[PDB]
Paper text:
S glycoprotein trimers protrude out from the viral membrane and are the major proteins on the viral surface, making it the main target for vaccine design. Sequential cleavage of S at the S1/S2 site followed by the S2’ site within the S2 domain exposes the fusion peptide (FP), which mediates host-viral membrane fusion, allowing entry of the viral genome into the host cell. Overall, the S-trimer structures are similar to those previously determined for B.1 in situ, and are similar across all variants.
In the open form of Alpha, residues 852–855 and the 630 loops are generally in the positions observed in the Alpha closed form. The 570 hairpin has moved slightly further out in chain A, and less far in chain C, where it is possible that K854 in chain A is interacting with D568 rather than D570, though this cannot be said in confidence. In addition, the A570D mutation leads to a new salt bridge formation between K854 and D570 in the Alpha variant in both closed (B) and open (D) states. The Alpha variant has an aspartate to histidine mutation at residue 1118 (D1118H). In contrast to the closed conformation, in the open conformation of Alpha, chain A H1118 continues to have two conformers, with a slightly stronger “down” conformation, while H1118 in chain B and chain C are now primarily in the upwards conformation. The density assigned to Zn2+ is present, but weaker, in the open conformation. The downward-facing H1118 (chain A) is accompanied by rotations of R1091 in chains A relative to the closed conformation, while R1091 in chain B has not moved. While the complete routes of allostery cannot be derived from our structures, they imply that the raising of the RBD has structural consequences throughout the entire S trimer.
Author numbering:
A (entry chain B): 27 to 66, 79 to 142, 154 to 160, 166 to 172, 188 to 209, 216 to 244, 265 to 297
B (entry chain A): 981 to 1127
C (entry chain B): 737 to 828, 853 to 1078
D (entry chain A): 298 to 622, 637 to 676, 689 to 736
E (entry chain C): 737 to 785
């Protein structure tokens, strides 16, 4: 299915405090009112393009992670991200991923040079200059506004062209290079944005 | 040119050409702005010549303090000088004054002047120089009754 | 501070900047020339009166009510009430080496001068402008203002209550307008905005590369070998100098266009306030009677009182 | 300084902005995190058993902060060569990844551990590349790797069919054939087992004694760094003009308190001018404001030199508590700036020399440069009343002289 | 059209002219001010009535 993203998908572009100010930044952003793909247990492989917006609306935490790469098999190194029942876990390896990757936490059936270990859930994934950069927020696809904070950056340098989720026995959009005008309040949180290319008033 | 071969003397001279061109275009611009200032003092000097010298000006404090009688121009290097002769009121005296005089039910106002009392007797006098005159039917005009 | 805007703390840059010679002296001396003229403008406009006339407490101005226009002792700057409206309605050092010199005449002193020009005007008419101040009852100098336009002075006296009530009402229309609307003082606000916007350009230009490998000169000092470092700095200073020269030049142009407005305001002071102007539409639409100056922020507001004919009746004439 | 900057031996009365002054940095502060992952060099240098050089060990060093000064400043190393890198600047450089290699060899064999070397160790045990980026660190180990009767734990490859490629390893034990006679898997004439063990008795000469070696190989690549040298730090100071470096953000300014609440991921703070307004201390996690060290034009206030050589000085903008302590005793704070040498008085006069914000200065009484709030003019009560008029009895004929510019020197360049 | 005058059609030049930053925004805005001033002048002189 398909749905309107409205003004979703803004994220803090740099690790800099700014307050009571309007700032113009040019970066890969989800275009405003973009038509984002919408999903409900098929878990297809999807292209990554230049960068991904991912979100889900859940009350049971059925979605559990993602896998990223090109071949998505042991012919290349690939990235695994999994929110297991006790930790967020991240690994880079030549995973021979399963034809139908899923968890069940009795069952693990998803399939090395990097590892790390740590409602509407929103995420943005970038892979630029060899950094896989993750942004997220958890919110109590609805029309509205909030900005995703940086979760983690992985200096892994790998090549990615397509990805797939992990499910336990969601919405996808893609970033484009856009100029955004961002509004910072006195507490230095982003409170509004203008996608400069949206319309002549913008 | 005495010290370096052409192929790199060009590179050194290109720096002097850029710097000396930038130096000169900065001077030219500031002269265009100064010229736009002197032009406004030449337009004002021409205007004061037409209006203070060739004429008499009622423009207050244009042709000097006081009431302008006449002015005489004098030249000076890169400029002009105006000698503004002006009448200035001096040694003012207090008088009691009234807007109108009443007699026989008629309100009288001054033609050209103002009414003043010397403390005992009423006169009309001109505004700018104390010159008392008897109040008469030929130096006042009637309008309306005394109410 | 031209050396500080261009090079900052870098001695390495300062040893290059000396090769450009006296550009930083010009850029300093031009801006100091603009700075001095701002004081000349404010003196030429306001300091036209050499004796500070106190306002008389009697306030028997023939029924005219200048309470909006005369000073208010309850305010620390002792501004008038309309001067306080104007002051509020014009709404608004650093690492970059900018500094914002204060004016010579404080906002109080220019408000004392307007109060002197105004208290002279209502108590003595034109006479204080061109000699010693000669007191005259306001009803009578108004009749001189009427007689000057060629309306016989009896038309003042016989209608003095109506004339006073019209004027007093019209002062209310000013106060309500300058309170309620935003758009009147745009002519001052534009000059405030242009100066602020000119600095916001000048400072953001420090983030430009101009072809250098970094816009932050401290990077080059830490990260390049001396010859390449100095070449990359020469790239930056060539751009920052030409950024600062573009600012100074447009401040010279603005200062000349403000000088032309200071000269006009000084002439409206001399001819509308210190006098009565026969010059059509110079001192406002209608026939001029008198004008009152009010010291808006870095500006002046003239309240031109004017006589306007009404209720035109046809007649046959020969 | 006026005579110099005006380039004249005579000066007319006025205020001259002869130069600018700045508060100088008192010291340099550095700040970086005090909790970090130190690189585990200890377990490669101080392992109980090292590798046999034919089977030389490798360990990846990554995602860590090094301090190679701990190594290079130690006296126990007998040899500390570096190639493409200097042992000192090694501690300033940073790398994507590092590989630590270690083995035991004879003392005579250390000279083979260099780029472009040849011989049994270089050719058949451990080969360095022609453009090797790393350092070779070696020390005598006859205190550890030898014993009475000899220690034969360690081995080296004595025979191979061909030379190793750089960083190649070969642990194969197939009997080497040195001639036309087939070996059929047994030793004999022209038929030799490819490895030999060192004669490490402790009494041997130094060339025959065992040496331990660690070789550090540095991956300088376009990939992101993961092994930097030490993120040093100083003590922290506030309310003083200092140079600063916070996580590489480097400048000069007054560090001071803040109440601006950064978000937990944020490190730097900027104003509306793309310029550093605040920074997080990476150790205390406090937020500091940064303010520029105060500066201003310094202006010399003088009567004409025909009148006096005494002068006052105005430091534009800055506060008198900050002005550097050149010899004047009198100090006064105008709203235009700190004024020195000039004497405040309670009189008022016409503005002789303007300073700013209503203050003017003049050479007056035994003379001194007084500083005063300017007189607007004489103060007058205008004697209005509802029935009085004043009329001049007399008149003055003024002549007022006015002067206007008209032209300027016609020029062409 | 400042970038059209300097760089013409070329993106490869435009990406360099952006390193000179605000310079083309100054020139576009200065000329815009002069252009509006021409309407102001003519309204001021003629539309008095
Ligand atoms: C003109 O007279 C005034 C005084 O007021 C007038 O004269 C009174 C006798 C009385 O008739 C009043 O109703 C009049 O209005 C003089 O003003 C005073 O001057 C003195 C100095 O001599 C000064 O101390 C007072 O403050 C002044 N009064 C006010 C109200 O300011 C004035 O000097 C006389 N002028 C001339 C030229 O004679
Ligand atoms: C990453 O590697 C993949 C292949 O492993 C590259 O993807 C191919 O790109 C070509 C076009 O250049 C396409 O025709 C193929 O269909 C792609 N294959 C897959 C599996 O995606 C990709 O170009 C590489 N990316 C980078 C940045 O080098
Ligand atoms: C989630 O993943 C973490 C690792 O990222 C698991 O933690 C490990 O658990 C095993 C025991 O099963 C330990 O031996 C390891 O030492 C643990 N590693 C770390 C880094 O703590 C964790 O058990 C996983 N949770 C579930 C429910 O599978
Ligand atoms: C910014 O943060 C401050 C606290 O850091 C918030 O201030 C509080 O606001 C509530 C009302 O919303 C008051 O009841 C509290 O008393 C305030 N605290 C203080 C210390 O002032 C403020 O609301 C936040 N604003 C935004 C826009 O996020
Ligand atoms: C006011 O002016 C009148 C003149 O119009 C003065 O009255 C005259 O006084 C002289 C003597 O000083 C007599 O010879 C005249 O006959 C008087 N004329 C009239 C019409 O009475 C009067 O004295 C003046 N008052 C003051 C106070 O000076
Ligand atoms: C002059 O006009 C003003 C109004 O424009 C008068 O001020 C008001 O006076 C009344 C009392 O008479 C107060 O209740 C109001 O609050 C005043 N207005 C304001 C805005 O404060 C003033 O009294 C008038 N004076 C004369 C002499 O007529
Ligand atoms: C001249 O015009 C004024 C108004 O500008 C008239 O004054 C008003 O007259 C009406 C009654 O006709 C009153 O209700 C108003 O209060 C008056 N205004 C004021 C301020 O007092 C005046 O009557 C007109 N005169 C003639 C002869 O038409
Ligand atoms: C000049 O500097 C001193 C500090 O050396 C200023 O004193 C402080 O003033 C503020 C108010 O502006 C107070 O809150 C502080 O408590 C004062 N500090 C001390 C130590 O007393 C002084 O105000 C400055 N004056 C000017 C005119 O700038
Ligand atoms: C008006 O002022 C003038 C001076 O400006 C007076 O003329 C002088 O009068 C005195 C005697 O009072 C003579 O000694 C002088 O020689 C006169 N000056 C000249 C140039 O001749 C004049 O008397 C004054 N008149 C009045 C009425 O006050
Ligand atoms: C979104 O895009 C898909 C094709 O990518 C299209 O089929 C669908 O109709 C679009 N939906 C909307 C609401 O535009
Ligand atoms: C090995 O141990 C010594 C102390 O026994 C220590 O000083 C040294 O630092 C250790 N090696 C390394 C590489 O740290
Ligand atoms: C790190 O340093 C700061 C002071 O600079 C101190 O407050 C903090 O406790 C230190 N952290 C640890 C773990 O010691
Ligand atoms: C002051 O100027 C006069 C001009 O006549 C000159 O004679 C005198 O020597 C000068 N004095 C000083 C101290 O410069
Ligand atoms: C001068 O003014 C100061 C206040 O600035 C005051 O403290 C002092 O007493 C005054 N002295 C005289 C003699 O008026």
């Amino acid at each position: 299915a398909y749905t309107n993203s409205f003004t979703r998908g803004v994220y803090y572009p740099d690790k800099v405090f700014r307050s009571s100010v309007l700032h113009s930044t040019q970066d890969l952003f989800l275009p405003f009112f973009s038509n984002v793909t919408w999903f409900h247990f098929d878990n297809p492989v999807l292209p990554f393009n230049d960068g991904v917006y991912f979100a889900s609306t859940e009350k049971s935490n059925i979605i559990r992670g993602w896998i990223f790469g090109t071949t998505l098999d042991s012919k290349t190194q690939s990235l695994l991200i999994v929110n297991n029942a006790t930790n967020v876990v991240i690994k880079v390896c030549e995973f021979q991923f399963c034809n139908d990757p899923f968890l069940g936490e009795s069952e693990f059936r998803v399939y090395c040079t990097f590892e790390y270990v740590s409602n509407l859930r929103e995420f943005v994934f970038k892979n630029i200059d060899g950094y896989f950069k993750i942004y997220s927020k958890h919110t109590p696809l609805p029309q509205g506004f909030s900005a995703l904070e940086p979760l983690v950056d992985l200096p892994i340098g790998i090549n990615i062209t397509r990805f797939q989720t992990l499910l336990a026995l969601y919405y996808v959009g893609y970033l484009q290079p856009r100029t955004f005008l961002l509004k910072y309040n006195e507490n230095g949180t982003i409170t509004d944005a203008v996608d400069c290319a949206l319309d002549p008033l913008s | 040119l005495a010290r370096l071969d052409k192929v790199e003397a060009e590179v050194q001279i290109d720096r002097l050409i850029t710097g000396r061109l930038q130096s000169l275009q900065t001077y030219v611009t500031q002269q265009l702005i100064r010229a736009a200032e002197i032009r406004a003092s030449a337009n004002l000097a021409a205007t004061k010549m037409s209006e203070c010298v060739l004429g008499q000006s009622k423009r207050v404090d244009f042709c000097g303090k006081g009431y302008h009688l006449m002015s005489f121009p004098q030249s000076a290097p890169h400029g002009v000088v105006f000698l503004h002769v002006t009448y200035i009121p001096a040694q003012e005296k207090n008088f009691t004054t009234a807007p109108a005089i009443c007699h026989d039910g008629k309100a009288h106002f001054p033609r050209e002047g103002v009414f003043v009392s010397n403390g005992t007797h009423w006169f009309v006098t001109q505004r700018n120089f104390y010159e008392p005159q008897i109040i008469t039917t030929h130096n006042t005009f009637v309008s309306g009754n005394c109410d | 501070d031209c050396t500080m805007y261009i090079c900052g703390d870098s001695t390495e840059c300062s040893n290059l900047l000396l090769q450009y010679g006296s550009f930083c002296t010009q850029l300093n001396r031009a801006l100091t020339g603009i700075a001095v003229e701002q004081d000349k403008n404010t003196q030429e406009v306001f300091a036209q009166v050499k004796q500070i006339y106190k306002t008389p407490p009697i306030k028997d101005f023939g029924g005219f009510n200048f309470s909006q226009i005369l000073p208010d002792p309850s305010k620390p700057s002792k501004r008038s009430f309309i001067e306080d409206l104007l002051f509020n309605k014009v709404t608004l050092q650093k690492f970059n080496g900018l500094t914002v010199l204060p004016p010579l005449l404080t906002d109080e002193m220019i408000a004392q001068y307007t109060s002197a020009l105004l208290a002279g005007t209502i108590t003595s008419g034109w006479t204080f402008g061109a000699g010693a101040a000669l007191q005259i009852p306001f009803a009578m100098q108004m009749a001189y203002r009427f007689n000057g336009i060629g309306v016989t002075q009896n038309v003042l006296y016989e209608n003095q209550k109506l004339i006073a009530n019209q004027f007093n009402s019209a002062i209310g229309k000013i106060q309500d307008s300058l309170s309620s609307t935003a758009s009147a003082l745009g002519k001052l606000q534009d000059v405030v905005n242009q100066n602020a916007q000119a600095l916001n350009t000048l400072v953001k230009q420090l983030s430009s590369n101009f072809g250098a490998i970094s816009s932050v000169l401290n990077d080059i000092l830490a990260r390049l070998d001396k010859v390449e470092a100095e070449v990359q700095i020469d790239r930056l200073i060539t751009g920052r100098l030409q950024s600062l020269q573009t600012y100074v030049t447009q401040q010279l142009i603005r200062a000349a266009e403000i000088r032309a407005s200071a000269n006009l305001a000084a002439t409206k002071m001399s001819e509308c306030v210190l006098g009565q102007s026969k010059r059509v539409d110079f001192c406002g639409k209608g026939y001029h009677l008198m004008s009152f100056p009010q010291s808006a922020p870095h500006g002046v507001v003239f309240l031109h009182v004017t006589y306007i004919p009404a209720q035109e009746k046809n007649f046959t004439t020969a | 300084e006026t005579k110099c900057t005006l380039k004249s031996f005579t000066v007319e009365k006025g205020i001259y902005q002869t130069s600018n002054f700045r508060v100088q940095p008192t010291e340099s502060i550095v700040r970086f995190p005090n909790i970090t992952n130190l690189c585990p060099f200890g377990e490669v240098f101080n392992a109980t058993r090292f590798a046999s050089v034919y089977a030389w060990n490798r360990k990846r060093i990554s995602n860590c902060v090094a301090d190679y000064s701990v190594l290079y400043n130690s006296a126990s190393f007998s040899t500390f060569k570096c190639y493409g890198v200097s042992p000192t600047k090694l501690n300033d450089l940073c790398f994507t990844n590092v590989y630590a290699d270690s083995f035991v060899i004879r003392g005579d064999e250390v000279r083979q551990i260099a780029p472009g070397q040849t011989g049994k160790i270089a050719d058949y045990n451990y080969k360095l590349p022609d453009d090797f980026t790393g350092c070779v660190i070696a020390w005598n180990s006859n205190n550890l790797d030898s014993k009475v009767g000899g220690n034969y734990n360690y081995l080296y490859r004595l025979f191979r069919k061909s030379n190793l490629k750089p960083f190649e390893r070969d642990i194969s034990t197939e009997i080497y054939q040195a001639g036309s006679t087939p070996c059929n898997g047994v030793e004999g004439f022209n038929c030799y087992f490819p490895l030999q063990s060192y004669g490490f008795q402790p009494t041997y000469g130094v060339g025959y004694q065992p040496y331990r070696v660690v070789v550090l190989s540095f991956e300088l690549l376009h990939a992101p760094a993961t092994v930097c040298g030490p993120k040093k730090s100083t003590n922290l100071v506030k309310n003083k003009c200092v140079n600063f470096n916070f996580n590489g953000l480097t400048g000069t300014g007054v560090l001071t308190e803040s109440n601006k609440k950064f978000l937990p991921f944020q490190q730097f703070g900027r104003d509306i001018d793309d310029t550093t307004d605040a920074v997080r201390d990476p150790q205390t996690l406090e937020i500091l404001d940064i303010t520029p060290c105060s500066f201003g034009g310094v202006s010399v206030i003088t009567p004409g030199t025909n009148t006096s050589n005494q002068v006052a000085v105005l430091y534009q903008g800055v506060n008198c508590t900050e002005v550097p302590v050149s010899t004047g005793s009198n100090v006064f704070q105008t709203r235009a700036g700190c004024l020195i040498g000039a004497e405040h008085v309670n009189n008022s006069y016409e503005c002789d020399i303007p300073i700013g914000a209503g203050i003017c200065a003049s050479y007056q009484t035994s003379q001194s440069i007084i500083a005063y709030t300017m007189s607007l003019g004489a103060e007058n009560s205008v004697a209005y009343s509802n029935n009085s008029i004043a009329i001049p009895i007399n008149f003055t004929i003024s002549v007022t002289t006015e002067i206007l510019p008209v032209s300027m020197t016609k020029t062409s360049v």
